[PDB]
Point group: C2
Chain length 650, copies 2
Amino acid sequence: AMIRKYRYGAPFDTEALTEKIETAEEAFPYGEISQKEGFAFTYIMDEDDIVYGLGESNRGINKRGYCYISNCTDDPIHTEDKRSLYGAHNFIIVSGKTTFGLFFDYPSKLTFDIGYTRMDTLKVSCENADLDIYVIEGENAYDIVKQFRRVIGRSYIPPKFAFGFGQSRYGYTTKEDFRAVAKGYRENHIPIDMIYMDIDYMQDFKDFTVNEKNFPDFPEFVKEMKDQELRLIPIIDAGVKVEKGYEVYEEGVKNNYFCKREDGSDFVAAVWPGDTHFPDMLNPEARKWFGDKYRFLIDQGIEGFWNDMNEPAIFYSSEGLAEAKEFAGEFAKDTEGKIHPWAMQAKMKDIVNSPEDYKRFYHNVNGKKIRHDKVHNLFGYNMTRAAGEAFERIDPEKRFLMFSRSSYIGMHRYGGIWMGKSWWSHILLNLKMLPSLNMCGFMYTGADLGDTTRDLLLRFLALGVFTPLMRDHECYQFENIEDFRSVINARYRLVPYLYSEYMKAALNDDMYFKPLGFVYPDDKMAIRVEDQLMLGNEIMIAPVYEQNARGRYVYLPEEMKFIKFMPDGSISEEVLEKGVHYVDVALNEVPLFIRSGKCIPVAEAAECVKDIDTENMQLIGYEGSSYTLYEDDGIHKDYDKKENYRVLTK
Amino acid sequence: AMIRKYRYGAPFDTEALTEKIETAEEAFPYGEISQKEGFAFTYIMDEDDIVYGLGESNRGINKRGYCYISNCTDDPIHTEDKRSLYGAHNFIIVSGKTTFGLFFDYPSKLTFDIGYTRMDTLKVSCENADLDIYVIEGENAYDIVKQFRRVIGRSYIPPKFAFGFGQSRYGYTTKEDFRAVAKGYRENHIPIDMIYMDIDYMQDFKDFTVNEKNFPDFPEFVKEMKDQELRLIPIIDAGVKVEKGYEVYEEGVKNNYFCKREDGSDFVAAVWPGDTHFPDMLNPEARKWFGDKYRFLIDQGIEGFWNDMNEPAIFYSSEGLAEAKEFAGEFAKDTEGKIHPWAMQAKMKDIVNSPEDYKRFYHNVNGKKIRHDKVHNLFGYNMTRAAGEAFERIDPEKRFLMFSRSSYIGMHRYGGIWMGDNKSWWSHILLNLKMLPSLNMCGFMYTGADLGGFGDDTTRDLLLRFLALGVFTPLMRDHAAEGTREQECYQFENIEDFRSVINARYRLVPYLYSEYMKAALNDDMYFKPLGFVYPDDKMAIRVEDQLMLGNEIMIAPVYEQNARGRYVYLPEEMKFIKFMPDGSISEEVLEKGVHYVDVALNEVPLFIRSGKCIPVAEAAECVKDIDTENMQLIGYEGSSYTLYEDDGIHKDYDKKENYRVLTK
């Protein structure tokens, strides 16, 4: 009754929500709806209004002052002007004198003009008036988000090992590249639980194969790593290689599981393996088929995966390549100078992730052919869905690590997200993206660091200490390796707390990271803070994101204990009063703040999730307070035991 | 006595220094010097060291932690990984326990590895050991800076009208376009003194011409604007268009004034006109001939210019085009998938500003030929020098507005610089803040950034915050890239906010001009890092987002979107001043320490130091109309301020009449 759904035209069923909401017949309650040329929602904002949401998108926590377009795109350079990233997360909340949330359930290009054109005007528009709009009421933003979290269903939950630290890099290839890392960390006592294998582990980049030469006996080797508490996490891409005799390819062609051109032929998209076809992610049979293919790696002992290139990305199509060559030919032979270099250059750029290509193939949705652009933002979502639904059929009681590059709301039930250059500013960018992603159901997230300096790496890791996905995209290639061990030690000492908070949040449709505004709604200073986040109900983080900085300014909305994990293995604490502070944070120290009347458990440092001692964990924070610890086996889904909850008291 | 020159090989004379320093005899005083792989200076820094300098370069005031290459480069994407921008300013200061300054007088590609490869390692290297290295001793960075400023010679001084506000856009083409800008500003009583003319004003992008169809009586049009205190400031590019009958081209060829290939053919580079030749800026007679050309504009009432593309920028050479067309021919006919799109794409980009092109042409320096790459960082510097020296011949008594995109230390005597093709990014406000003190250390004081951001689309609020920074930068102009969102002040809602911010500039002009002149005449800095002023304050020395100005104030602009204030650190008590939109000036004493201050979008902030005061005039709409007779004194009771002012037009700097002591 605090949520209403307004339907326009004949919307595509995106399955974003799991709760059914009845269609409202009354007037639309906020702003104005026009269906003249397409669809447009327009709303005049109050000057004090803050606009939260949009999950994975550019800029700040408050979205006012710019334009955002939901249109999943593989963009390598996330500069301030970019209007479209990997995710399409169509949920906003206006927070002010009048407060309300809106979900725009629409699968295509959706433009949020949020004060870009006129400062006071919010305008959300798309090309077709075929969509549901959910309006949600509440006393404040935080209340509105929790109701949204309920109706889109419970977020993906990873196995406990995924709260360890993982190492990654595009390059690894041989059993040796991998064994070095094993000794690299283990012999230097650096905690680690995971190692990601990038595309190079596949035979000629063929989904659901392993390179036979380099990996003659894969199961055995997977076990070799698992005996040292190291779990390999192989990638899987959207594109299936065109190649006679390759069974994934042959099956897809035979049974019509690929996306087709207008004429019925299988669309060709060039990606990592050269020519490929895209599995039709919106066709149920295709999905089950594609997902079933993970058994191949699972049966070999693999306990987790990552998806990439699932926008889906396109280096070029055959049509696009054919046009590019034809143009190159004219340029080649032009002497009048009628064809300029920059035009040649532009044509070459245009065939990548080309809008025209997205109009070249179709989805077969239960017999009905739908042009891909019309449902573009659903592709990566349904690829991750295919994996997740496969996992359930295969082993329903077991959690697999899984996360994806591209997404839409509704994918949050099946896997997490990772954010993809090595800039200081990307520390803060990734920080600000977290609360918004939590608002939209994506809790298991983290970022990579794309030209890297030691100090940039350490600051970046100090943020990752807190992000559920913590991975390096090495640690040993520098001076003073203890700094890097020291930072990861903090991560493993905080895992029981972090995992606990994540489970409690996930199981209750709550947020792991929160903006200060959600926790301290009456504090006008707090609501505007964007470079600090609240975690669970116990702490606040505030990472250093400036090069050569030895400290930073913070605002404390209440009395807190300033905590630092020191490099020597100790923990410094200082009580600090409500208000503004400058705090000192050395490169090898990990800071956080514990709120008045709270405490958190801290474990002794361990090198793998399995070996952390959560028996007599030290409690840090305020005497007299208590903490409810959540603990299970981290492997299965026996979430509801009363035994999972233990009350610790400092 | 405090400076020493160390020579290596047979350095090219850059004329960077005006003071002659004799070649020293003893061992190099700091670190180690090596000639194994070309040339290298290596130094092991103490952990608490701070490294200042490098004028126009990327990153922060403290340069530690990255790599900086002195290689004048036309690069419009100033992301933080970029190593080379438009300037080549080879002055650094190591500040800490052991403190000293170095100036690498070398005209070619010079690599500053400042703790990048190794955190404790400062390594400076180049391809050949043909250079002078000046070592400057001193008790602190500041002292070292002023000594350097002494020997590089007095900084360029602009006419006073150049401290007004300026509007510019790649696009203004007709009388209509300029009158609309005129109307758009004056009718809304928004102050302004300058309107910039971008390349469209020429006949087919030909240097030293004006479009005959669009400006049939240009002298008349220039007066129509000037009569409104609107001074037109036309662009001049490095490239002279290749065209038969075009006198500039014909003379350059006939007299061998152009840069040539080794066979003596005139080197061809495509830029805005298409095919052009580059005037040989290192050839003294070429230099004089090109400079004299400005007379064609000055004789029409033009009082100032901007020099562009003078890296020199090259879209492609003739050799490059043919290589690219050949590669494309192959790609076209490829059937096996041997030649990939991205290979083709890379070739296309590679012919732009190509290091190979820079090895393809030469300068003629008194009959002696030198390959351009070997002196690449001197080109823009000598083009602006060309113009500067021509102004002196043409009208010795008069100041001309002049600034350039590319530069080298030495050029600071002849023009300013603008921080080039930035973008409408919030991060660029801070970038442009941070570059200011560094440009000052290297003698470049008349500078500023494209307010609102050059590239991309700007929002109302971004422009307003940018403007509030520009208030303090001697160059204050709103500039825009082609096809971008129109970012004149009159295009946005509630234009009173724009009037309020610009009013604050004009109310401050007598003070800012005063400090500029005082600074330039005494080889001192206009902007200073906090550390220079508060050397014993451990916290102050690391502040990078505030700057001291002259000896009276400190600034701290808001550079975050949606922010309603920001953190500041005050190293002593100060009066927190804000220029309010209603025209009033709010004041609040704040004590030494950390503060968060409220600064609304339409509010201009600054702090006045303990025991100081500044003069603030009433708002005026052009510089000539500012009432300096009786301004209000803002600041601390019992303090005094020495106002410098002259006619703002000629070069009579010495007179006691120029100074007036005002006391609060």
